[PDB]
């Protein structure tokens, strides 16, 4: 009983300190910065071959290889430059909602409604791709996957909890709890020591991978968060929600810096990504478009008008030379 | 593709594309149906030709030159809104209801309203099954159908009680172009695959009418 009052006053103290820091809005400091102009980007590749809807996609660290997961039970690895199909991996279950590409390029990960994260080894002596390990322990669907090393992966599930695995042993090294709803996405910090997650309780929190502790929590969205991405310098992140708005938070300030809402946008954001510099913020909506925002001034700098259905995934190469988007129409397009 | 090693890489890609095309053709005669309903509703014993295969359970019985795949999503214990779109393209929804579970009737009715009015299922027809007639006929005599439905006004006979139950479920449609194929099945009813097949035939014809431009 008394603890409830203790909780409420603690929240008030957090809000009090949070308000004290705010002196001037981000849009109030970057008003005299000249705009970026109209960002016109034209499609360069159109990777076709997927039958069902594409639900996930990840870029290789070499900025040339791609991996895409579709509802037809196929995991295809593409050669971005030549549009060649390097691999085609059949999946035990066709219900897949995520896929990840290892930083070293030796492994690839997959998961979905089966509540299992499957890891496939690409550099095998037998010449075929084999399922190296199957990670189980989540009681709900799998939302996101991200490799930390060749033997460490972070997963997000609809259980309202995240996890850190040891692929070699296969056991669950650490479990992150604190969310009150389905966890829909996560992003690893550039130094791979902190990561943030967006859940369906309309909140995001910063987790210390080494300590297994919730360092900070960020609110402001009116609905569930669908996508999340770190700023390139690792001191901020952006979130996409069904509220039809994207928001930029700052870890050090511990607040919301800016909002990217437009009166003409009515649908939710499915994916969010940054550019190499951190000035453009690319988001994919349900209206079959991706809007490029001037992340420093919140102005629509362009639109990637393509695909005939909902855009489900986004990606920007590590060298920042292209942007790939996947949609439910079963086509991947690379923009430059 | 000028280099010798690049030419072989192109050859491998064409081999993959051919296999991908072949796999699609072999998975073209499959009808995907979604199973829904409360627990102990008979959603695990609809068609006795199971051939099954925590998470998502599949059943892949075949009947009359057509491969039927039934997906059971029980056990997710999550918010439906975030994975319901994964089944947006299912041919139809098979909804099961137990007439002998008065206390579970209201939960089923809420389920039907949510599923029927979902933005993704605005066009998918529903094949409603009202299972366990015999128990309902035995239970109605001892307990009248008034405790579960205080607004019931008709007689206390099996024909009227079953008709009233069906009407309530059908009243949640509130949309055109979507039809509900209601049927009454018992425990010893082998001809459950026939009901799904003929119901699916009508759904397929209506879909073709839209694509062919006749509607």
């Amino acid at each position, epitope marked *: 009983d008394q603890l409830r009052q203790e909780a409420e006053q603690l929240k008030n103290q957090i809000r009090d300190a949070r308000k004290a820091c705010a002196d001037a809005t981000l849009s109030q400091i970057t008003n005299n910065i000249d705009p970026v102009g109209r960002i016109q980007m034209r499609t360069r590749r159109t990777l076709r071959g997927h039958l069902a809807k594409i639900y996930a996609m990840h870029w290789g660290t070499d900025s040339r290889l791609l991996v895409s997961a579709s509802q037809d039970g196929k995991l295809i690895i593409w*050669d971005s430059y030549t549009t060649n199909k390097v691999h085609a991996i059949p999946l035990r279950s066709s219900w897949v909602m995520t896929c990840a590409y290892a930083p070293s390029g030796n492994y690839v990960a997959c998961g979905g409604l089966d509540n299992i994260c499957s890891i496939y080894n690409l550099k095998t002596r037998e010449g075929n791709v084999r399922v190296s390990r199957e990670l189980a322990g989540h009681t709900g669907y799998l939302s996101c996957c991200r490799f930390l090393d060749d033997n460490q992966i972070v997963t997000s599930s609809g259980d309202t909890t995240c996890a850190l695995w040891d692929i070699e042993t296969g056991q669950q090294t650490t479990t992150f709890t604190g969310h009150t709803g389905d966890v829909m996405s996560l992003s690893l910090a550039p130094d791979t020591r902190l990561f943030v997650s967006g859940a369906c309780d309309a909140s995001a929190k910063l987790w210390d991978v080494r300590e297994g502790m919730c360092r900070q929590t960020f609110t402001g969205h009116e609905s569930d968060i669908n996508a999340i991405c770190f700023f390139p310098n690792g001191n901020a992140f952006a979130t996409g929600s069904d509220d039809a708005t994207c928001r930029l938070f700052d870890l050090r300030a511990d607040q919301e810096l800016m909002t990217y809402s437009h009166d003409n946008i009515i649908c939710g954001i499915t994916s969010v990504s940054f550019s190499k510099s951190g000035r453009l913020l690319l988001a994919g909506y349900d209206d079959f478009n991706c809007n490029v925002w001037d992340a420093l001034k919140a102005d629509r700098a362009g639109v990637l008008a393509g695909h005939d259905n909902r855009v489900s995934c986004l990606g920007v190469t590590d060298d920042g030379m292209a942007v790939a988007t996947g949609s439910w129409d079963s086509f991947l397009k690379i923009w430059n | 593709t000028l280099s010798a*090693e690049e030419r*072989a890489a192109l050859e491998r890609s064409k081999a993959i594309e051919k296999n991908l095309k072949e796999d699609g053709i072999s998975a073209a005669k499959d009808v995907k149906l979604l199973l829904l309903g409360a627990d102990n509703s008979g959603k695990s014993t609809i068609v006795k030709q199971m051939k099954i295969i925590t998470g998502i359970v599949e059943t892949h019985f075949t009947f009359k030159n057509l491969h039927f795949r039934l997906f059971d999503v029980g056990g997710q214990r999550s918010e439906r809104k975030k994975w319901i779109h994964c089944f947006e393209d299912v041919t139809a929804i098979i909804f099961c209801v137990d007439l002998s579970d008065y206390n579970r009737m209201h939960e089923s009715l809420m389920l039907f309203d949510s599923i029927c009015n979902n933005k993704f299922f605005i066009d998918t027809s529903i094949i409603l099954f009202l299972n366990k007639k015999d128990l309902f006929g035995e239970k109605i005599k001892k307990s009248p159908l008034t405790i579960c439905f205080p607004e019931y006004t008709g007689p206390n006979t099996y024909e009227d009680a079953a008709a009233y139950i069906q009407a309530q479920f059908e009243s949640k449609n509130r949309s055109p172009n979507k039809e509900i194929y209601c049927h009454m099945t018992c425990a010893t009813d082998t001809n459950n695959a026939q009901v799904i097949f003929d119901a699916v035939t009508d759904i397929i014809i209506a879909n073709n009418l839209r694509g062919c431009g006749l509607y």
Partner: single-chain antibody
Amino acid sequence: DVQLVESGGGLVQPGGSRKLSCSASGFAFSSFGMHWVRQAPEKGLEWVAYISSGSGTIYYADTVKGRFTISRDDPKNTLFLQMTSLRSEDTAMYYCVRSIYYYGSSPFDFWGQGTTLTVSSSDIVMTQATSSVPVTPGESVSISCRSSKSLLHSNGNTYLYWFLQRPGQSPQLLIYRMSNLASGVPDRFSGSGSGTAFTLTISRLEAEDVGVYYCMQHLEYPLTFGAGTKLEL
């Protein structure tokens, strides 16, 4: 483990015919292109024929074109070479080699054990200047080989391969394009070059590095090897 075993060699009279069989066991034989490479008695490696994955593409050397035919039997996991009219110049040890071609692959990693055949009695030229190089353990070594055309392509890939053959064993891949260390080889080996001049440098030479080193070009068929450089201890 990956294993290629060949059989069908022996003694044959001139003008006769023989069949060589190479049976694979331990990998997806259906997914690997296969080569036939022959080594005449203490002469050097020579490329003979190549059959793609699925048998779509086939190549032959000008020497054996018409006389030889290469066939693949995927269900049985066997590779065949049917030789029709054999001269006295066809006597050699025939090797079965596997190659998988996709972006970033190693297309000559594994070589067969080899089968001996005895018979009774335009192209890119790659040259290795030196034939022998005495050296002792712990001393750095360098081996170089030139070419007629520039092996560098518009892709940016230099198509050159380095193989090492130990006394009494089959050749082993070390560097597959110009500097990529083949899986399993020690990191002491290194490769470098530009266009038409290439060099392989070994640091902290060991007792197991004695053998013959061949430099091969995979830019365009027919594949061609180098004369070979021998390391003497």
